Design an enzyme around this catalytic site. Structure first.
Site, PDB file in Angstrom:
ATOM      1  CB  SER A 133      -0.115 -12.331  -9.832  1.00  7.23           C
ATOM      2  OG  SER A 133       0.225 -12.628  -8.492  1.00  7.23           O
ATOM      3  CD  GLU A 167      14.406 -19.885 -34.211  1.00  7.97           C
ATOM      4  OE1 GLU A 167      14.412 -18.722 -34.663  1.00  7.97           O
ATOM      5  OE2 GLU A 167      15.107 -20.239 -33.241  1.00  7.97           O
TER       6      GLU A 167
HETATM    7  C1  HEM Z   1       9.096 -10.668 -22.081  1.00  8.06           C
HETATM    8  C2  HEM Z   1       7.861 -11.165 -21.990  1.00  8.06           C
HETATM    9  C3  HEM Z   1       7.025 -11.044 -20.699  1.00  8.06           C
HETATM   10  C4  HEM Z   1       7.404 -10.690 -19.466  1.00  8.06           C
HETATM   11  C5  HEM Z   1       8.819 -10.320 -18.976  1.00  8.06           C
HETATM   12  C6  HEM Z   1       6.237 -10.719 -18.614  1.00  8.06           C
HETATM   13  C7  HEM Z   1       6.199 -10.423 -17.268  1.00  8.06           C
HETATM   14  C8  HEM Z   1       5.317 -10.989 -16.381  1.00  8.06           C
HETATM   15  C9  HEM Z   1       5.498 -11.186 -14.959  1.00  8.06           C
HETATM   16  C10 HEM Z   1       6.738 -10.783 -14.142  1.00  8.06           C
HETATM   17  C11 HEM Z   1       4.406 -11.775 -14.473  1.00  8.06           C
HETATM   18  C12 HEM Z   1       4.175 -12.176 -13.004  1.00  8.06           C
HETATM   19  C13 HEM Z   1       4.642 -13.611 -12.825  1.00  8.06           C
HETATM   20  C14 HEM Z   1       3.648 -14.527 -13.479  1.00  8.06           C
HETATM   21  O1  HEM Z   1       2.427 -14.293 -13.305  1.00  8.06           O
HETATM   22  O2  HEM Z   1       4.071 -15.480 -14.179  1.00  8.06           O
HETATM   23  C15 HEM Z   1       3.486 -11.962 -15.569  1.00  8.06           C
HETATM   24  C16 HEM Z   1       2.248 -12.564 -15.554  1.00  8.06           C
HETATM   25  C17 HEM Z   1       1.457 -12.606 -16.680  1.00  8.06           C
HETATM   26  N1  HEM Z   1       1.847 -12.782 -18.013  1.00  8.06           N
HETATM   27 FE1  HEM Z   1       3.455 -11.831 -18.657  1.00  8.06          FE
HETATM   28  N2  HEM Z   1       5.158 -11.095 -19.386  1.00  8.06           N
HETATM   29  C18 HEM Z   1       5.609 -11.300 -20.671  1.00  8.06           C
HETATM   30  C19 HEM Z   1       4.859 -11.680 -21.758  1.00  8.06           C
HETATM   31  C20 HEM Z   1       3.539 -12.053 -21.720  1.00  8.06           C
HETATM   32  C21 HEM Z   1       2.711 -12.418 -22.851  1.00  8.06           C
HETATM   33  C22 HEM Z   1       3.216 -12.447 -24.306  1.00  8.06           C
HETATM   34  C23 HEM Z   1       1.492 -12.721 -22.389  1.00  8.06           C
HETATM   35  C24 HEM Z   1       0.218 -13.164 -23.141  1.00  8.06           C
HETATM   36  C25 HEM Z   1       0.105 -13.099 -24.469  1.00  8.06           C
HETATM   37  C26 HEM Z   1       1.519 -12.532 -20.965  1.00  8.06           C
HETATM   38  C27 HEM Z   1       0.486 -12.753 -20.099  1.00  8.06           C
HETATM   39  C28 HEM Z   1       0.652 -12.686 -18.738  1.00  8.06           C
HETATM   40  C29 HEM Z   1      -0.460 -12.514 -17.836  1.00  8.06           C
HETATM   41  C30 HEM Z   1      -1.942 -12.411 -18.246  1.00  8.06           C
HETATM   42  C31 HEM Z   1       0.026 -12.458 -16.611  1.00  8.06           C
HETATM   43  C32 HEM Z   1      -0.770 -12.310 -15.304  1.00  8.06           C
HETATM   44  C33 HEM Z   1      -0.802 -13.722 -14.733  1.00  8.06           C
HETATM   45  C34 HEM Z   1      -1.679 -13.815 -13.522  1.00  8.06           C
HETATM   46  O3  HEM Z   1      -1.860 -12.788 -12.828  1.00  8.06           O
HETATM   47  O4  HEM Z   1      -2.186 -14.930 -13.251  1.00  8.06           O
HETATM   48  N3  HEM Z   1       2.780 -12.138 -20.581  1.00  8.06           N
HETATM   49  N4  HEM Z   1       4.078 -11.479 -16.718  1.00  8.06           N
END
Ligand code: HEM
Lengths: 416, 97
Positions: free
Chosen positions: B12, B78
């Site tokens: 991350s 919604e």
């Molecule tokens: C059920 C929906 C989702 C889950 C459970 C999930 C899960 C995660 C987790 C556990 C992380 C690490 C914690 C964090 O960086 O906040 C993460 C980061 C991230 N989320 Fe998700 N995600 C989901 C949906 C999405 C969607 C829809 C997008 C964009 C359209 C997205 C984009 C990102 C990105 C790019 C990261 C990397 C953040 C970083 O490294 O700075 N995520 N996600």
């Protein structure tokens, strides 16, 4: 055997007819623990200056311990009395010797030593561990001072140190070997002439759980050390702390017995060769101690595994140590004590340390009797009191990227 | 799961943007207990909604059983789909929308 001479100085000797060589030394307490940051290392510098004097055939050496200092004149048995006079002279003229001294050369020597203790990975790790554990108090200071503070010492500083600490109430003449005690005492009495003064108040110190990480990625191993507040020389758990340490004992991966050493941790860390070596120790100061282990891990990816397993084996100390482990630890501690007290130099150093820092020295037979009184329940009570769930102090030198930060190791101290 | 795999391959990012490799922390004592703060704040607000005023986010007309013969005064998705719906109406052509 003890005899308090005129001036009130005490001559303590442990004479044995079987001794290969004799030793006699003057120790005046007040090691690094008596210094402060600006003038740190002055005790070591003064002791080196005194020990650099003409030896008249003997072997004059400096001690430079954490809490006490002294000059020891090793010599064969028949010459002991002469050596006696020598050190007496060296201490009756200590102020004169310091005044007439060009501290330059002695200061480069002390700086070389200070660099040595900052290059030998184990010495660096343990010095840093002691500094962080007792941070904020004089006991944190290096025994030999730092390269930055040594160069800033002058003759007047050493003279003040001698005047404060080289006094009758704060000095002891320790001896061992094969000689008549009365002869040595008489020889020293006629020659010892030191200033009067009260025993300097020994500065306070209190353990503080902390972590220090000198990560140098250029080294080939990870030299770490983890310890808890141990038992000082006064505590009746002293030998109990040593037994607890020996329960886990030493280990060197490449040694032949590595596959056969009793301690459970040795069998645990050899399954994937987690660690290259480790040694458990119970360092004891006058009133406080550090009980823990030092370790060198070759594989940089297994520092966390070693810390986890070692702290789990510590957890075993308060629950599941068997009579076999306790008996082994008792026997090994007795043997280690007897080994430490063979060389006359070691016996003299031990006599000086004990007499200065606790006032009375328990004979080796008394120590054996005290250790043999330990039962497994006593060891487990000590583990509950001092090891189970107590703050730890950590140190590391190189390739410690895998050494997880404090909270992981600290929480390992109480998980079942 | 694929999202988490693609996250684990490179890790991350940071609010500072610069590489975190110089100072990285485990997750069990750190950011799991931060996850608990965030989770409990989430659940507290989620309870303030679910138990008190649970229909605030919804639309009242959704409680009238569907009747093809009478269109309601206004059609809105919604709330969370409203932006895109707006975009859909901004473009006149249906295919364009
Ligand atoms: C059920 C929906 C989702 C889950 C459970 C999930 C899960 C995660 C987790 C556990 C992380 C690490 C914690 C964090 O960086 O906040 C993460 C980061 C991230 N989320 Fe998700 N995600 C989901 C949906 C999405 C969607 C829809 C997008 C964009 C359209 C997205 C984009 C990102 C990105 C790019 C990261 C990397 C953040 C970083 O490294 O700075 N995520 N996600």
């Amino acid at each position: 055997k003890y005899t308090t001479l005129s001036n009130g100085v005490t001559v303590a000797t442990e004479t044995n007819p079987a001794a290969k060589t004799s030793s006699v030394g003057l120790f005046f307490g007040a090691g690094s623990r008596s210094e402060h940051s600006h003038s740190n290392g002055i005790s070591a510098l003064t002791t080196n200056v005194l020990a650099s004097q003409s030896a008249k055939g003997s072997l004059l050496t400096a001690k430079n311990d954490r809490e006490f200092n002294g000059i020891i004149a090793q010599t064969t048995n028949d010459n002991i009395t002469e050596a006696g006079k020598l050190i007496a002279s060296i201490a009756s003229n200590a102020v004169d010797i310091v005044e007439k001294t060009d501290l330059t050369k002695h200061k480069q020597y002390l700086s070389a030593q200070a660099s040595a203790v900052e290059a030998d990975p184990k010495s660096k790790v343990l010095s840093h561990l002691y500094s962080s554990a007792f941070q904020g108090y004089s006991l944190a200071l290096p025994t030999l001072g730092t390269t930055e503070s040594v160069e800033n010492l002058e003759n007047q500083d050493s003279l003040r140190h001698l005047a404060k600490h080289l006094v009758n109430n704060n000095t002891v003449i320790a001896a061992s070997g094969n000689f008549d005690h009365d002869k040595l005492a008489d020889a020293i009495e006629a020659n010892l002439k030191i200033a009067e003064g009260v025993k300097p108040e020994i500065k306070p110190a209190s353990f503080l759980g902390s972590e220090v990480r000198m990560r140098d990625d250029t080294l080939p191993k990870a030299y770490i050390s983890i310890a808890v507040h141990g038992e000082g020389l006064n505590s009746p758990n002293y030998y109990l702390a040593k037994v607890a340490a020996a329960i886990y004992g030493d280990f060197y991966l490449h040694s032949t017995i590595a596959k056969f050493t009793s301690p459970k941790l040795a069998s645990i860390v050899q399954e994937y060769n987690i660690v290259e070596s480790y040694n458990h120790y119970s360092k004891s100061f006058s009133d406080t101690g550090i009980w823990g282990y030092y370790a060198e891990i070759a594989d940089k990816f297994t520092v966390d595994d070693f810390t986890h397993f070692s702290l789990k084996e510590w957890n075993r100390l308060s629950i599941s140590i068997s009579e076999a482990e306790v008996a082994r630890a008792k026997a090994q501690v007795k043997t280690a004590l007897a080994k430490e007290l063979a060389n006359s130099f070691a016996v003299t150093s031990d006599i000086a340390e004990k007499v200065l820092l606790v006032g009375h020295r328990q004979s080796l037979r008394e120590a054996f009797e005290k250790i043999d009184a330990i039962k497994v329940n006593d060891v487990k009570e000590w583990g509950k009191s001092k090891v189970w769930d107590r703050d730890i102090v950590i140190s590391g030198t190189g390739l410690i990227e895998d050494l997880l930060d404090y909270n992981r190791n600290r929480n390992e101290m109480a998980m079942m | 799961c694929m999202h988490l795999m693609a996250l684990h391959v490179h890790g991350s990012s940071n609010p500072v943007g610069i590489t975190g490799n110089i100072d990285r922390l485990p997750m069990h004592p750190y950011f799991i207990f931060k996850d608990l703060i965030t989770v409990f704040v989430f659940l507290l607000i989620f309870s303030l909604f679910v138990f008190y005023s649970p229909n605030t986010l919804g639309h009242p007309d959704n409680y009238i059983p569907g009747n093809p013969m009478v269109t309601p005064p206004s059609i809105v998705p919604e709330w969370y789909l409203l932006p895109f719906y707006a975009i859909l109406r901004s473009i006149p052509d249906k295919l364009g929308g």
